Amino acid sequence: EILEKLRSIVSVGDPKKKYTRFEKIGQGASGTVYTAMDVATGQEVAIKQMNLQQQPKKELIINEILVMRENKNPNIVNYLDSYLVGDELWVVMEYLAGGSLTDVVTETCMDEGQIAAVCRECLQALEFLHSNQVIHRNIKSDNILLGMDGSVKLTDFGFCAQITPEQSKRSEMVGTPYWMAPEVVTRKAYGPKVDIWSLGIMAIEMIEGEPPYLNENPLRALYLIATNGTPELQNPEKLSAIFRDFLNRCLEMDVEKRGSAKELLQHQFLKIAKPLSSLTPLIAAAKEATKNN
């Protein structure tokens, strides 16, 4: 009964009377996400509703709230408040008009300057997290929110881990299979660089529309990742050399030679980054492609 700690993180108050105009904007294993309007202040918010009985390891919910409230940053979605209502936890965040990077990678073609800009913002987030001793462990396009202002933010801290000088490596087989690093899949001690791998896979998503092996089942993908290591592109000759080089540093098998986020922020590939405004057309196009979907 560590549900003691959770009940005292949470604010008290009528959540269904503090906020109105609930429209579902998203869903996940994590839960359903709604937009809503604060009765007071008028401010529109994003609220995630998470069934508790679905999550057996309730330290992960606690850990999730704490990591968001203690590691605020422009490239991380902004925690406002939390509330327990019945057998359901509500997490309130700042709403940003925009979309997931998943809508853009599946519905559009990004150029290298657009890709370089997303990567840079993501690496900025990870360098911040990694220096504050936090591994995300679930990097993927579905967990990147793009703002109509041009913003790029990380979300979904439900799988994240805190490390220490003493316990500097983790050992949980955690993540989404197609984005998981080999050292995770093969049950070795792993550190912050598993996020770098995952970002590399997200770069493939932006190039090819999908992570490697997506047409395979999750379990098979796991086998493939462990046996193949560094995945191959469908059409590698389509990319510039600096881009290819960035990918090779992200998707290095040798953890020690794989880029940290600090290193990677200095790579040449990010120097072709367009301005963030260049992303808003992508967002516009994704909304149009999913008018029905």
Ligand X SMILES: N[C@H]1CC[C@@H](CNc2nccc(Nc3ncc(C(F)(F)F)s3)n2)CC1
Which tokens go with 50?
């998470």
Does position 127 interact with ligand X (CB under 6 A)? The reply is: no
Residues 6+ apart with CB under 8 A from 121: 75, 152, 153, 276
Binder to ligand X among 77, 129, 206, 276 (CB under 6 A)?
77
Which tokens go with 116?
């370089």
Does position 98 interact with ligand X (CB under 6 A)? The reply is: yes
Q: Which stretch binds ligand X (CB under 6 A): 64-72, 96-104, 114-122, 197-205?
A: 96-104
Does position 110 interact with ligand X (CB under 6 A)? The reply is: no
Q: CA-CA distances (angstroms) from residue 29 to 51, 159, 176?
A: 10, 12, 11
- 3-state DSSP assignment of residue 88: strand
Does position 71 interact with ligand X (CB under 6 A)? The reply is: no
Give min distance, CB of 7 to ligand X, in A: 22
Count of residues near ligand X by CB under 6 A: 17
Return the number of other C-beta atoms located less than 10 Å from residue 151's C-beta: 18
Q: Which stretch binds ligand X (CB under 6 A): 9-17, 92-100, 107-115, 272-280?
A: 92-100
| Residue whose CB is less far from ligand X, 67 or 96 | 96
Give min distance, CB of 33 to ligand X, in A: 5
Does position 26 interact with ligand X (CB under 6 A)? The reply is: yes
| Residue whose CB is less far from ligand X, 81 or 156 | 156
Does position 156 interact with ligand X (CB under 6 A)? The reply is: yes
Amino acid (1-letter code) at residue 247:
L
Does position 31 interact with ligand X (CB under 6 A)? The reply is: no
Binder to ligand X among 105, 122, 125, 145 (CB under 6 A)?
145
Does position 212 interact with ligand X (CB under 6 A)? The reply is: no
Strands 79-84 and 44-51: unpaired
The C-alpha atoms of residue 224 and residue 189 are separated, in whole angstroms, by: 20
Binder to ligand X among 83, 95, 178, 243 (CB under 6 A)?
95
* Burial class of 162 by CB neighbour count within 10 A (0 to 12, 13 to 18, 19+): middle
Binder to ligand X among 31, 99, 175, 211 (CB under 6 A)?
99
Give min distance, CB of 143 to ligand X, in A: 5
Closest CA to 22 of 5, 4, 34, 8: 34
Does position 175 interact with ligand X (CB under 6 A)? The reply is: no
Angle at 152 between CA 151 and CA 154, to 5 degrees: 140
Angle at 150 between CA 144 and CA 154, to 5 degrees: 20
Does position 115 interact with ligand X (CB under 6 A)? The reply is: no
Residue 105: in which H helix or E strand, if any?
Answer: helix 101-107
Which tokens go with 291?
């008018």
* Site for ligand X, rule CB under 6 A: 25-26, 33, 46, 48, 77, 93, 95-96, 98-100, 142-143, 145, 155-156
